[PDB]
Amino acid sequence: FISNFVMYDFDKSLDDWCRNNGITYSRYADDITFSTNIKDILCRVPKVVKKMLSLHVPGLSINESKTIFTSMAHNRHVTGVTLTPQGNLSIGRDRKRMLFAKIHKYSLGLLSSEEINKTKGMIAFANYLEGDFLLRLQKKYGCELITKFLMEG
DNA sequence: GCGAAAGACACAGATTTCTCCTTCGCATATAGGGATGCGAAGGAGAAATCTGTGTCTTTCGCAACCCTAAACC
Numbered sequence: 001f002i003s004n005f006v007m008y009d010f011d012k013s014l015d016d017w018c019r020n021n022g023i024t025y026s027r028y029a030d031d032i033t034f035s036t037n038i039k040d041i042l043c044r045v046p047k048v049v050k051k052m053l054s055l056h057v058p059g060l061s062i063n064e065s066k067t068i069f070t071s072m073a074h075n076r077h078v079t080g081v082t083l084t085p086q087g088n089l090s091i092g093r094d095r096k097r098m099l100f101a102k103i104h105k106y107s108l109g110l111l112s113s114e115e116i117n118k119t120k121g122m123i124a125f126a127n128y129l130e131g132d133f134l135l136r137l138q139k140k141y142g143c144e145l146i147t148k149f150l151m152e153g
Numbered sequence: 154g155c156g157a158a159a160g161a162c163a164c165a166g167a168t169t170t171c172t173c174c175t176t177c178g179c180a181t182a183t184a185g186g187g188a189t190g191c192g193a194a195g196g197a198g199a200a201a202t203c204t205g206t207g208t209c210t211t212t213c214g215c216a217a218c219c220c221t222a223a224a225c226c
Contacts, residue, residue: 121222
C-alpha cells in the first residue's frame, strides 16, 4: 500500500502527458505499459519517463534490459493474458489442450486425487477469464460427467 | 541491503639491460712520411619490465516463516 501512495505524483504527471498524444498508460507494481494505434510515436517516451522519474522520485532508475516493442504480427500479452488479433482475451491454446487431455484421462479413471484439485482450480480460473469454458466442456463430455467431476471431493 | 575471500583500477619507483659516447690504436695504399678511414674497449645515461600499496565491486544458506486450489507482483 505504501508504494502506491508514494508513486502518486509520477502516475499523475505521466497520465496527462500520455492523454494528449493518444497513448494509453497503466502500471502494475513495477511494470509500465503503453499502447497506441499511430505509427512511430512510441520511440520518444523512453526519454520522457526518465525525465519524469528524475524530477518526481529521485533515486529510482529504469532497467534497460527489459524493454519490449510489439505489434499485431507477433505474440501479445499483458501480465499473463493473451490478446487475440480480433481483440479478445484468451488463456492460450496450449493450456486449452492440456485441460482437455486431463478431463479425457479423468473419464477413464486414471487421475490421482491431487490432480483433481489442481485441475479444478485451474478450470475455475480459466472459466473466470473467458466466461464460456464450462459450456464448451459440457458440450463435449456431457453434463453428467462434468457435474460428477465438480462434486467430487 | 550486503558476509568473506580474490580481482580490477590508478599511481610510484626501482632495476637490469641496452645503446650512445670518448680515446687511441692500426692501416694502408700511396721510398719514408703523412693522411683518411675504421676497429676496440671503458663509461655513460636512457628505457622497458616488474613489483609495490591503497581504494571499491560482487552478493551469503543471514535466531525470529506456514502447512487449501489457480494467476500476478
